[PDB]
Every structure is written in C-alpha cells, then in structure tokens.
C-alpha cells in the first residue's frame, strides 16, 4: 500500500514541525536502506537556505538582520541560529562563533574593489576576497545553498577569472560557479563534532542507527588502498 510523506507543510514557519521516521522503507513498504530505524523522536525546524530573500519586492536592496539565539538542531550535525529582521524570522545555519545579540548583513551588490569579510555576512562570490573561507555554497543564482553545510566544513575561494569564481569543496575538489551566487563567510558551527566519542552501543541506537548484519562476506577486489588522481573541476557555467 502506498504511504504518504510527512513533508506536507506549504508555508514556512519558525516553530518546530512534526516529523515521522521512515526506517529505510520506501513508499512501497520494502527496505531500501538498511541500518536505519528505532531512533529517538524528533521535531523538524524549517531551515531557510536562501540567505538573500527580501521581505517585499518593493525594496530589493541589501538588508541587515539580528541574531536572537543559537539552538541545537537534532536533524543536522551543525547548530542553527534564529535570525529576525523586518517582520519575519528565519532559521539559518550558524557559523563558528555566532552568538546571541549579534547583527548579520545580507547583500548581493557586486562591488569592483572589495568588501570586508565578516564572520556572518553573506555576499556574492564576486565581491569576496580571494583568500576567503566560505560555506553554504549556492550552485546556481537563486537556486539556494546546497553544498558545505556539515559541522566544521568550510570551503576556500581560489580565484575569479572572466567573471567566474572557482572554489574548493571540503572534499578537496575544485568547483566552478558564477560569481553572482550568494555565499556565507566563515566556518560552520560545532567544530568538534568529529572529535565526539560515542561511549556505548546504545548511543548509536538513540541516534537512530540499527546494528549491521552478521553475515561474513569475504572481501573482493574493490578493497585495498586505492590511489586515484583528483577528478577534473566540476563547472556549472553553461558556455554558449
């Protein structure tokens, strides 16, 4: 029997929304991804990925917002921060040292010389300095942030040529993107998420991971330390 996905909400709201676990079962009802299920109940926060979003289209100019509080989000491995400006509030991903009572500037005006890089400001890649650490990379203009959102992951801008910016992803793979895409300066919060130690098998079950199967599989040819050259740069710029 076909099931219904819980992602039915249409209007954005800062308050936590109800969430139903899947357990690896697809809409049909069969297991597709193993080792998922039986976790602690969680609520989902509506995260606004697009940093640049004016309240009204009457004034498309840059706007500045204020940070209210930094909370812990069970879904993602990072920490989200509540940000309010004008007549609306938004949940956005907090950088390394974002705290309460702080002001964050969002802008898109690509200036010729430069703009000073602050720890929370979001600016287009065309105005940022060459040596800037960035996160929440927008792959295409207006598409929204998709890359570099995990805890402690930060990409570094490399160069800007013929009106096009090239960045380095955390996987040490170069990515080419138009300079007008919005990006956030800094490193994602909760830096020591990698150094966290799980004390017992039960803590894995609390997170929601079921134990692996006990079948003993002999290793094939895929195993072994593989040394492979770095793949070529991935470019999203459509050359006419």
């Amino acid at each position: 029997a076909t099931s219904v996905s819980w992602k039915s909400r249409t209007k954005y709201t800062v308050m936590p929304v109800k969430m139903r676990k899947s357990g690896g079962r697809n809409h049909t009802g069969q297991i597709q991804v193993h080792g998922i299920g039986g976790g602690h109940k969680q609520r989902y926060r509506m995260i606004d990925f697009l940093r640049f979003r004016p309240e009204h289209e009457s004034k498309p100019g840059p706007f500045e917002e204020k940070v209210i509080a930094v909370r812990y989000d069970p879904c993602r491995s990072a920490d989200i921060a509540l940000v309010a400006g004008g007549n609306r509030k938004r949940w956005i991903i907090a950088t390394e040292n974002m705290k309460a009572g702080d002001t964050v500037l969002n802008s898109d005006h690509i200036g010729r010389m430069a703009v000073a890089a602050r720890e929370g400001d979001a600016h287009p890649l065309g105005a940022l300095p060459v040596g800037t650490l960035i996160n929440n990379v927008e792959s295409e203009p207006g598409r929204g942030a998709q890359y570099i959102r995990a805890a402690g992951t930060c990409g570094v801008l490399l160069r800007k040529v013929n009106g096009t910016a090239i960045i380095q992803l955390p996987s040490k793979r170069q990515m080419q993107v138009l300079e007008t895409c919005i990006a956030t300066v800094g490193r994602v919060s909760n830096v020591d998420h990698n150094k966290r130690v799980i004390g017992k098998a039960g803590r894995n079950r609390w997170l929601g991971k079921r134990p692996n199967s006990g079948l003993w599989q002999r290793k094939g040819g895929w195993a072994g330390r593989k040394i492979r050259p770095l793949p070529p740069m991935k470019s999203y710029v459509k050359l006419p």
Binding site: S5, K7, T10, K11, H27, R143
Partner: peptide, 11 residues
C-alpha cells in the same frame, strides 16, 4: 529557491 511543497503531498 526551494519551495516547501512536495509533489506527492500536493493535490
């Protein structure tokens, strides 16, 4: 942008 609707859930 990322609209919050889902194709399956919508009518």
């Amino acid at each position: 942008a990322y609209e919050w609707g889902v194709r399956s859930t919508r009518k």
